[PDB]
Each structure stands twice: as structure tokens, then as C-alpha cells.
Short mmCIF file of all heavy atoms in Angstrom, two decimals:
data_model
loop_
_atom_site.label_atom_id
_atom_site.label_comp_id
_atom_site.label_asym_id
_atom_site.label_seq_id
_atom_site.Cartn_x
_atom_site.Cartn_y
_atom_site.Cartn_z
N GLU N 67 100.44 98.53 131.76
CA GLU N 67 100.04 97.77 130.55
C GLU N 67 98.53 97.84 130.29
O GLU N 67 98.03 97.23 129.32
CB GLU N 67 100.52 96.29 130.60
CG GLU N 67 102.01 96.10 130.56
CD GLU N 67 102.66 96.85 129.43
OE1 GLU N 67 102.15 96.73 128.26
OE2 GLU N 67 103.68 97.63 129.74
N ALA N 68 97.78 98.43 131.19
CA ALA N 68 96.30 98.43 131.11
C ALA N 68 95.72 99.01 129.83
O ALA N 68 94.84 98.34 129.20
CB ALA N 68 95.73 99.28 132.27
N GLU N 69 96.21 100.17 129.34
CA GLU N 69 95.73 100.73 128.20
C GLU N 69 95.89 99.80 126.96
O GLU N 69 95.01 99.56 126.26
CB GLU N 69 96.45 102.07 127.91
CG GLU N 69 95.55 103.29 127.75
CD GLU N 69 96.16 104.43 126.95
OE1 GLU N 69 96.25 104.26 125.74
OE2 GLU N 69 96.58 105.42 127.58
N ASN N 70 97.13 99.21 126.87
CA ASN N 70 97.46 98.23 125.90
C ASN N 70 96.61 96.98 125.93
O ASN N 70 96.04 96.49 124.91
CB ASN N 70 98.97 97.88 125.95
CG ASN N 70 99.81 98.98 125.26
OD1 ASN N 70 99.43 100.15 125.15
ND2 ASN N 70 101.01 98.57 124.80
N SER N 71 96.59 96.39 127.15
CA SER N 71 95.75 95.20 127.35
C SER N 71 94.30 95.39 127.11
O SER N 71 93.62 94.54 126.55
CB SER N 71 95.92 94.59 128.75
OG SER N 71 97.13 93.92 128.91
N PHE N 72 93.83 96.59 127.36
CA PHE N 72 92.40 96.93 127.02
C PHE N 72 92.22 97.01 125.50
O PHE N 72 91.21 96.41 125.05
CB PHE N 72 92.05 98.24 127.59
CG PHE N 72 90.65 98.56 127.60
CD1 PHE N 72 89.75 98.22 128.57
CD2 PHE N 72 90.05 99.17 126.42
CE1 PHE N 72 88.40 98.52 128.55
CE2 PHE N 72 88.73 99.46 126.34
CZ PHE N 72 87.88 99.15 127.42
N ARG N 73 93.10 97.68 124.76
CA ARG N 73 92.91 97.89 123.36
C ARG N 73 92.91 96.45 122.65
O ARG N 73 91.95 96.19 121.83
CB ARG N 73 93.81 98.82 122.59
N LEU N 74 93.81 95.61 123.08
CA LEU N 74 94.00 94.30 122.54
C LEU N 74 92.79 93.38 122.84
O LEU N 74 92.25 92.60 121.91
CB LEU N 74 95.31 93.72 123.04
CG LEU N 74 95.83 92.33 122.44
CD1 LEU N 74 97.27 92.16 122.85
CD2 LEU N 74 94.98 91.25 122.92
N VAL N 75 92.29 93.30 124.07
CA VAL N 75 91.13 92.46 124.24
C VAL N 75 89.90 92.91 123.43
O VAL N 75 89.23 92.12 122.83
CB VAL N 75 90.71 92.38 125.73
CG1 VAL N 75 89.38 91.79 125.86
CG2 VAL N 75 91.76 91.63 126.52
N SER N 76 89.80 94.32 123.37
CA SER N 76 88.73 94.90 122.62
C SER N 76 88.71 94.61 121.14
O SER N 76 87.71 94.23 120.58
CB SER N 76 88.80 96.47 122.80
OG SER N 76 88.41 96.72 124.11
N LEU N 77 89.89 94.74 120.51
CA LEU N 77 90.10 94.45 119.11
C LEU N 77 89.82 93.03 118.84
O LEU N 77 89.25 92.59 117.77
CB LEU N 77 91.45 94.87 118.65
CG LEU N 77 91.66 96.37 118.45
CD1 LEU N 77 93.18 96.68 118.23
CD2 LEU N 77 90.88 96.84 117.27
N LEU N 78 90.13 92.03 119.76
CA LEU N 78 89.94 90.60 119.54
C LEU N 78 88.56 90.10 120.06
O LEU N 78 88.32 88.90 119.97
CB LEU N 78 91.04 89.77 120.15
CG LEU N 78 92.52 90.13 119.89
CD1 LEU N 78 93.26 88.74 119.87
CD2 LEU N 78 92.92 90.83 118.66
N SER N 79 87.67 91.06 120.42
CA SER N 79 86.32 90.75 120.82
C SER N 79 85.23 91.33 119.92
O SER N 79 85.49 92.31 119.33
CB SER N 79 86.05 91.37 122.23
OG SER N 79 87.05 91.05 123.29
N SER N 80 84.13 90.68 119.77
CA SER N 80 83.03 91.19 118.94
C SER N 80 82.41 92.38 119.47
O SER N 80 82.53 92.56 120.70
CB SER N 80 81.99 90.08 118.64
OG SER N 80 81.60 89.58 119.91
N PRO N 81 81.79 93.27 118.68
CA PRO N 81 81.00 94.37 119.24
C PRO N 81 80.24 94.01 120.59
O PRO N 81 80.49 94.73 121.56
CB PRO N 81 80.05 94.70 118.12
CG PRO N 81 80.76 94.40 116.93
CD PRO N 81 81.60 93.22 117.18
N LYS N 82 79.47 92.91 120.66
CA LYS N 82 78.64 92.67 121.79
C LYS N 82 79.46 92.09 122.91
O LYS N 82 79.11 92.28 124.11
CB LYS N 82 77.35 91.82 121.49
N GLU N 83 80.57 91.40 122.62
CA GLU N 83 81.56 90.99 123.76
C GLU N 83 82.39 92.03 124.27
O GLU N 83 82.83 92.02 125.41
CB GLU N 83 82.37 89.78 123.26
CG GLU N 83 83.27 89.12 124.32
CD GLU N 83 82.57 88.70 125.69
OE1 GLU N 83 81.45 88.15 125.62
OE2 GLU N 83 83.19 88.91 126.74
N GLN N 84 82.76 92.91 123.36
CA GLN N 84 83.60 94.05 123.72
C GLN N 84 82.94 94.87 124.71
O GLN N 84 83.47 95.34 125.71
CB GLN N 84 83.89 94.87 122.40
CG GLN N 84 85.06 95.87 122.59
CD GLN N 84 84.70 97.10 123.38
OE1 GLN N 84 83.57 97.60 123.19
NE2 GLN N 84 85.59 97.62 124.26
N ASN N 85 81.60 94.98 124.61
CA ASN N 85 80.80 95.76 125.54
C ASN N 85 80.63 95.10 126.90
O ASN N 85 80.62 95.90 127.98
CB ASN N 85 79.49 96.07 124.93
CG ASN N 85 78.65 96.90 125.86
OD1 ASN N 85 77.66 96.35 126.47
ND2 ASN N 85 79.07 98.09 126.23
N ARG N 86 80.44 93.80 126.93
CA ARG N 86 80.44 93.12 128.31
C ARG N 86 81.72 93.25 128.98
O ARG N 86 81.81 93.57 130.21
CB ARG N 86 80.05 91.68 128.08
CG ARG N 86 78.64 91.39 127.70
CD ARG N 86 78.27 89.89 127.74
NE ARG N 86 78.91 89.21 126.65
CZ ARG N 86 78.43 89.00 125.45
NH1 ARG N 86 77.22 89.39 125.11
NH2 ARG N 86 79.15 88.32 124.54
N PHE N 87 82.85 92.97 128.29
CA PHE N 87 84.23 93.23 128.84
C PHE N 87 84.39 94.64 129.28
O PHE N 87 84.91 94.76 130.45
CB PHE N 87 85.25 93.01 127.69
CG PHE N 87 86.68 93.43 128.02
CD1 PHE N 87 87.38 92.76 129.07
CD2 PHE N 87 87.29 94.48 127.42
CE1 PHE N 87 88.66 93.13 129.30
CE2 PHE N 87 88.60 94.89 127.71
CZ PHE N 87 89.27 94.24 128.71
N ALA N 88 83.95 95.63 128.63
CA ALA N 88 84.14 97.02 129.07
C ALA N 88 83.29 97.24 130.40
O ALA N 88 83.75 97.95 131.32
CB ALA N 88 83.71 98.04 128.00
N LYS N 89 82.07 96.80 130.43
CA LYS N 89 81.29 97.06 131.71
C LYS N 89 81.99 96.41 132.81
O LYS N 89 82.15 96.93 133.94
CB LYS N 89 79.78 96.65 131.61
N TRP N 90 82.67 95.28 132.53
CA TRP N 90 83.37 94.55 133.57
C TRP N 90 84.63 95.27 133.99
O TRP N 90 85.10 95.30 135.19
CB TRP N 90 83.60 93.09 133.20
CG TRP N 90 84.47 92.25 134.02
CD1 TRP N 90 84.12 91.55 135.23
CD2 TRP N 90 85.81 91.79 133.90
NE1 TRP N 90 85.16 90.81 135.76
CE2 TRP N 90 86.21 90.97 134.91
CE3 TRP N 90 86.70 92.04 132.85
CZ2 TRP N 90 87.47 90.39 135.02
CZ3 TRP N 90 87.97 91.55 132.95
CH2 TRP N 90 88.34 90.72 133.99
N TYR N 91 85.36 95.80 133.05
CA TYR N 91 86.66 96.45 133.25
C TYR N 91 86.57 97.90 133.90
O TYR N 91 87.43 98.45 134.38
CB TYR N 91 87.52 96.53 131.93
CG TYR N 91 88.98 96.72 132.12
CD1 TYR N 91 89.81 95.71 132.24
CD2 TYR N 91 89.57 98.01 132.09
CE1 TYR N 91 91.19 95.86 132.30
CE2 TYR N 91 90.93 98.25 132.17
CZ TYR N 91 91.71 97.07 132.33
OH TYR N 91 93.13 97.25 132.36
N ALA N 92 85.33 98.47 133.74
CA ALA N 92 85.16 99.87 134.16
C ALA N 92 85.72 100.12 135.56
O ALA N 92 85.37 99.46 136.51
CB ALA N 92 83.72 100.24 134.02
N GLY N 93 86.50 101.22 135.69
CA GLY N 93 87.06 101.66 136.92
C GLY N 93 86.12 101.75 138.18
O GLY N 93 86.61 101.68 139.39
N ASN N 94 84.77 101.84 137.99
CA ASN N 94 83.88 101.84 139.06
C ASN N 94 83.32 100.45 139.51
O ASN N 94 82.47 100.36 140.40
CB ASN N 94 82.65 102.72 138.70
CG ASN N 94 82.99 104.18 138.80
OD1 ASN N 94 84.09 104.60 138.89
ND2 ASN N 94 81.92 105.04 138.74
N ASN N 95 83.94 99.44 138.89
CA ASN N 95 83.39 98.11 139.18
C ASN N 95 84.39 97.39 140.06
O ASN N 95 85.49 97.07 139.71
CB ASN N 95 83.22 97.44 137.77
CG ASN N 95 82.63 96.02 137.86
OD1 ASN N 95 82.58 95.37 138.97
ND2 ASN N 95 82.26 95.45 136.82
N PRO N 96 83.91 97.06 141.35
CA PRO N 96 84.76 96.24 142.25
C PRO N 96 85.43 94.99 141.74
O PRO N 96 86.38 94.66 142.30
CB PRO N 96 83.74 95.86 143.30
CG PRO N 96 82.65 96.91 143.31
CD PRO N 96 82.58 97.39 141.84
N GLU N 97 84.84 94.31 140.74
CA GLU N 97 85.35 93.12 140.17
C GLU N 97 86.33 93.24 138.95
O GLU N 97 86.76 92.28 138.34
CB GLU N 97 84.26 92.20 139.75
CG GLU N 97 83.15 91.79 140.84
CD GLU N 97 83.82 91.18 142.10
OE1 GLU N 97 84.99 90.61 142.07
OE2 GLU N 97 83.14 91.36 143.19
N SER N 98 86.62 94.52 138.59
CA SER N 98 87.58 94.88 137.57
C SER N 98 88.95 94.64 137.98
O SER N 98 89.37 94.94 139.15
CB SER N 98 87.42 96.35 137.14
OG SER N 98 88.54 96.56 136.30
#
């Protein structure tokens, strides 16, 4: 469900929050 959960959080987040979420979700991030 990752791809889906990702698009949905993104769409419901503002440009500047979408970007924080993304740095946090990135596959290289231990806390993702």
C-alpha cells in the first residue's frame, strides 16, 4: 500500500509539508 499511502499523504499536504514528509519517507532514511 506504500505507493497509495504516499500519493494520499502528499495530496493532503501543502507544498512545504509534502516536502518534509518526503525527506522523512525517503528509502535512504532509517526513520522512514
Side-chain angles (χ1 to χ4, degrees), residues 67-72 74-81 83-88 90-98:
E67 294 309 310
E69 237 205 72
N70 282 25
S71 283
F72 190 94
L74 190 167
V75 171
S76 290
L77 285 170
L78 310 213
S79 306
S80 50
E83 184 52 40
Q84 197 281 322
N85 178 251
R86 288 190 292 265
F87 170 66
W90 173 80
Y91 200 90
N94 285 15
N95 181 347
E97 304 306 334
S98 172

